[PDB]
RNA sequence: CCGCGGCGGUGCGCCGCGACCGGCUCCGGGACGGCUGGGAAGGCCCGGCGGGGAAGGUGGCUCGGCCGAGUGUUACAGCCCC
RNA sequence: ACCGAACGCCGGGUUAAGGCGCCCGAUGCCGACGCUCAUCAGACCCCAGAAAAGGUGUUGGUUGAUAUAGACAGCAGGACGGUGGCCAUGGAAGUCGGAAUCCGCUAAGGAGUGUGUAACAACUCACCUGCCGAAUCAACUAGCCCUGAAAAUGGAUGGCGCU
RNA sequence: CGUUCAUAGCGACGUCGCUUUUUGAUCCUUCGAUGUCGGCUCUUCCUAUCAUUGUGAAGCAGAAUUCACCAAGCGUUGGAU
RNA sequence: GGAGCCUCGGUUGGCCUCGGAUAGCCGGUCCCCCGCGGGGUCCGGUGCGGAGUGCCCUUCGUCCUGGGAAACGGGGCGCGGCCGGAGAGGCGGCCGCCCCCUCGCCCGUCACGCACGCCGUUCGUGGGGAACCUGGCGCUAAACCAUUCGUAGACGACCUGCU
């Protein structure tokens, strides 16, 4: 796995059929990827772990992408994790504030090789749930659960460095 | 010393981006760095946006937090913020530069002619100032 | 046709590269008020790091060796050699363009100067990293002449405050003479905020 | 991570008169000015009620160490006006075990000779921070008296004479003897 | 010899254009399909049914000129949301 | 000798592996999100350099607590008796060591954390209040940073530099 | 161990390192030759600091001291075999 | 003032506050303090900066005549005096007198090789350097050798002496 931003897919898969098993049963996962492609390898990896099933063992029944029900509302996501260190694997319960899902999983990834220089491949998602503004654990959240927020934007830095490569004027960073 | 604030229900002008030169309120507050924003009136479809390319006016209009962008429409529509940015220093001196960059080759002419007989007239009332200012001093 | 650029409020290596690039396309470049130049990192870390390349010369004969350059404008200079090509005939051309200086002296002392945002300490810093003077490096390190640099820029600002006295002094009248005159330039004024200025 | 915002409140007293030009807080009252400026801190030094009541700082989008500045220049002015309107009197006693340490202000309070520390015919002459004020007690014996509004300059002072009467290739747990801070107070109390 | 008529090869030297074809790299327009026969949205509103933040509310306190502003509590809907 | 790719002589196009502050072709993107300041920073296969073990440096986790029966620290009040308990006498009545190791009063104090004593004494280390006014605290874990980290001509993320 | 006290100074059983002023391994370079030990003489560097400056430690009362830090500026000699 | 080799780059100017950045810019002070200014308070304006380098200044065909608005401005490398400028000043400013002109903005009114579609045009330029013809006012050599000396010396060099 890599990444650009993720997409929720629904990807239902089984074991094919044989004489002794003829309607086996369908397993279905949340599966982010950039591209149905991935999707559905990361669907068999997943699925190799739990179930003895393969690519060859089965077939892929129905892969989807899964729509955000809910973009224009903002929300928090709890997302729990399971990396691999250095050292050992760990289990985290990470949470995010988001529009969807997908942006949520997506930043997450981003967060995870910042703060742990974990990369993807070796991260596993396990349940992404949104959540309350209660049942947020995390302060980093917390803090923008607020009707009448307010804070300035202090030191406005300035980008269009460029557009006047060189001027008179010194410039300008209180707004 | 702040004067402008990242409140809910604050008008911003999008310095640039797909919407760049328009007006849009200031919704809900996503995170550190991104503001979920709309912009009914000002052709904005309700959308998160980061605050690096806001910059932000001296207009709060007042609706709450999470309204449904019929209410921030209203709440447009009554104070009538098309018409009071409008009014304002900085969106006329927006609506110069952009005359100013329309201009065409016979326009600039004309203009060139204006100014070399309007900075003439005005520079002749300047050295009778001076004179005057020094005939006070003597 | 040439650019003068107020090396305060710069940062030292940030400026030096893009004076390089301009020096290299013929543009010449004058760097005034070099001691104004301010290196990211704190003090001390810098002096050190001045302090080594003043170990390094030639054991047999130092006479030869790399020649360390104390004042703040050979100090720029220095590095703005460092990203030239100088050894070619068209990297030593480059570099006779570039006009380095302590301080500001009679030519640009009544020019206007620029600023290079991009190499501008407010902008390219966090305000709550820490920084040296290059100016104070260079004292330290053997610069002789720091007070007299800042005895004769006492006086340049003196001079200067008068002459921008007199400059508002017109501008003021200028304020005044358009509202004097504002119906016999009224129909020009006009034309002048319909293209759009003046607005 | 980024906290949102955080502030506090110094809550100055109706005879001081604070004023703050920009973020160089200049602080008058009974006894006199005390300047500091903190442009090196980062913050928003408001100042809000009618009789200029309280001193208002707050920091936004602080980490950890930029929020730890906080308390820190409330703080500072809290001993600011402490010391415009009380004033700062650190006490320090002499000590030692033969050799009774010869004090002797100068000037005003500006020098302090310290003759014959542990026999010694070093004579020290330590001068005081510009605004502090030595002198030699009454109703005391072996004891100096520090005065002064800007508390900073006044420690500083202390430490100075502290510092000036130390030994040297001797066990300092058997040769305790030097002029030492004995109490930090105030000139006057109310 | 004048025709620079018709055809053929050419130009002393430096130039430019034009249209045709080949191979490229871009730009601007439009018209369609499929999906959770897309998801969200918008607009009109009506009838219900609950839950939450938290309110034209009330209340302790604070700050300004009964009104405006800032915290705090129980929480219906006369701000909204689900 | 690695990675990419294998050469007739040339024009246009496009790539690879690598890059794009300046040296040096290309980010002079209004690039996105974090992390990290180093008086030895760090900066890309082969490769030219460090470990065990540490660090309330800062950032994430994990697990457990705690607390309105208003805590947590911060200061103030007591720390006993059955009892020279038993083994050990060389002295251990809590205290070089070790088997023990409970009851009373209890509000509550271990047959005792230490200091120190030949041995005591004396001191010191729960349970509870008084004040103050919301979170507090422990143990792991892994990121960057730091300690660990000493070589001889002056010196090398390639250089300049860079926060 | 240090009367007592693991850690002032030490430090078993174990363990992790650096160093190339030891000696080995090795044989890449040089066999149409790179003059093979020591001493003298002279310069320069390193620090893994004996002394000297400034300091923290002690089982530092003083004196004498070992332990450690910044640190290589300046020194580090005359002889008998 | 005339020719005449050569070396090239250029192809409007910008004649300036200081600085700040969790702030600044301008006014005006009714009022107060200092040396027309400087500092203060108070108030009024601006502030994604229009007293803006996203800027300003300047115009880019020539002439003619015959109206309007604007109108004493410009010139003669016009001429004399008084300034300011030393950091590498190298540039300005301000004052007398002589002669000449009517230039910016609109309109009328004609004409200028109109070189017959086609390239280095257009300036800084009286450029930098070398060699050559005119006027006015100025100038009137040192150096080195040789010789000498000995504060010096391999030799050069150096210190000295010579109507
Ligand atoms: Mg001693
Ligand atoms: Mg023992
Ligand atoms: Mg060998
Ligand atoms: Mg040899
Ligand atoms: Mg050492
Ligand atoms: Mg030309």
């Known amino acids: 796995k890599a990444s650009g931003t993720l997409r929720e897919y629904k990807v239902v898969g089984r074991c094919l059929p044989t004489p002794k098993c003829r309607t086996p049963p369908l397993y279905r996962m949340r599966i982010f990827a950039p591209n149905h492609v991935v999707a559905k390898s990361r669907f068999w990896y997943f699925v190799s772990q739990l179930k003895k099933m393969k690519k060859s063992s089965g077939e892929i029944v129905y892969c989807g992408q899964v729509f955000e029900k809910s973009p224009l509302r903002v929300k928090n996501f709890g997302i729990w994790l399971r990396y691999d260190s250095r050292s050992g694997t760990h289990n985290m319960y990470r949470e995010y504030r988001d529009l969807t899902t997908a942006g949520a999983v997506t930043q997450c990834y981003r967060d995870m090789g910042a703060r742990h220089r974990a990369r993807a491949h070796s991260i596993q998602i396990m349940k992404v749930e949104e959540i309350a503004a209660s049942k947020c654990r995390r302060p980093a959240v917390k803090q923008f659960h607020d009707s009448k927020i307010k804070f300035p934007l202090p030191h406005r830095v300035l980008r269009r460095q460029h557009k006047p490569r060189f001027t008179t004027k010194r410039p300008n960073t209180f707004f | ?34 503001a979920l924003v709309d912009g009914p009136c000002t052709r904005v479809r309700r959308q998160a946006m980061p605050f690096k390319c806001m910059q932000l006016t001296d207009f709060i209009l007042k609706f709450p937090h999470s309204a449904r962008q019929k209410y921030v429409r209203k709440a447009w529509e009554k104070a009538d913020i098309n018409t009071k940015w409008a009014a304002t220093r900085w969106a006329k001196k927006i609506e110069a530069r952009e005359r100013k960059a329309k201009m065409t080759d016979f326009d600039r002419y004309k203009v060139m002619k204006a100014k070399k007989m309007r900075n003439r007239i005005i520079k002749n009332e300047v050295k009778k100032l001076q004179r005057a200012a020094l005939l006070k001093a003597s | ?73 050979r100090i720029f200079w220095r590095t703005v050699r460092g990203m030239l090509p100088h050894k070619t005939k068209r990297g030593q051309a480059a570099l006779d363009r570039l006009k380095v200086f302590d301080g500001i002296p009679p030519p640009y002392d009544k020019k206007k100067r620029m600023v290079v945002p991009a190499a501008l300490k407010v902008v390219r810093l966090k305000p709550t990293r820490k920084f040296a003077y290059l100016g104070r490096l260079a004292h330290e390190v053997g610069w002789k002449y720091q007070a007299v640099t800042a005895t004769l820029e006492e006086k340049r600002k003196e001079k200067a405050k008068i002459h921008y006295r007199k400059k508002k002094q017109l501008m003021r009248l200028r304020k005044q003479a358009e509202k004097n005159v504002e119906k016999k330039i009224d129909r020009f004024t006009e034309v002048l905020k319909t293209h759009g200025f003046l607005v | 991570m980024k906290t949102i915002l955080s502030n506090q409140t110094v809550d100055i007293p109706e005879n001081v008169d604070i004023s703050l030009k920009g973020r160089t807080v200049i602080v008058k009252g009974p006894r006199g000015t005390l300047r500091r400026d903190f442009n090196h801190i980062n913050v928003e030094l408001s100042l809000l009620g009618k009789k200029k009541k309280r001193l208002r700082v707050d920091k936004w989008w602080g980490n950890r160490k930029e929020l730890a500045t906080v308390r820190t220049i409330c703080s500072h002015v809290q001993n600011m006006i402490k010391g415009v309107t009380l004033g700062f009197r650190y006490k320090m006693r002499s000590v030692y075990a033969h050799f009774p340490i010869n004090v002797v202000i100068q000037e005003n309070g500006s020098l302090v000779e310290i003759r014959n520390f542990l026999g010694e015919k070093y004579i020290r002459r330590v001068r005081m921070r510009p605004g502090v004020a030595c002198s030699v007690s009454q109703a005391q014996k072996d004891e100096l008296v520090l005065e002064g509004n800007d508390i900073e300059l006044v420690s500083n002072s202390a430490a100075l004479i502290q510092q000036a009467t130390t030994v040297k290739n001797k066990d300092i747990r058997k040769f305790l003897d030097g002029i030492y801070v004995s109490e930090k107070g105030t000139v006057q109390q109310a």
């Open chain 2, 1 to 34: 010393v702040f004067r402008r604030f990242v409140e809910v229900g604050r008008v911003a002008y999008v310095s640039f981006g797909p919407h760049a030169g328009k007006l849009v309120a200031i919704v809900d507050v996503i995170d550190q760095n991104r």
């Open chain 3, 1 to 73: 046709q040439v650019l003068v650029l107020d090396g305060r409020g710069h940062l030292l290596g940030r400026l030096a590269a893009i004076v390089a690039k301009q020096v290299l396309l013929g543009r010449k470049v004058v760097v005034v008020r070099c001691e104004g130049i301010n290196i990211s990192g704190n003090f001390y870390r810098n002096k050190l790091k001045y302090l080594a390349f003043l170990r390094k010369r030639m054991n047999t004969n130092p006479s030869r060796g790399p020649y360390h350059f104390r004042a703040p404008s």
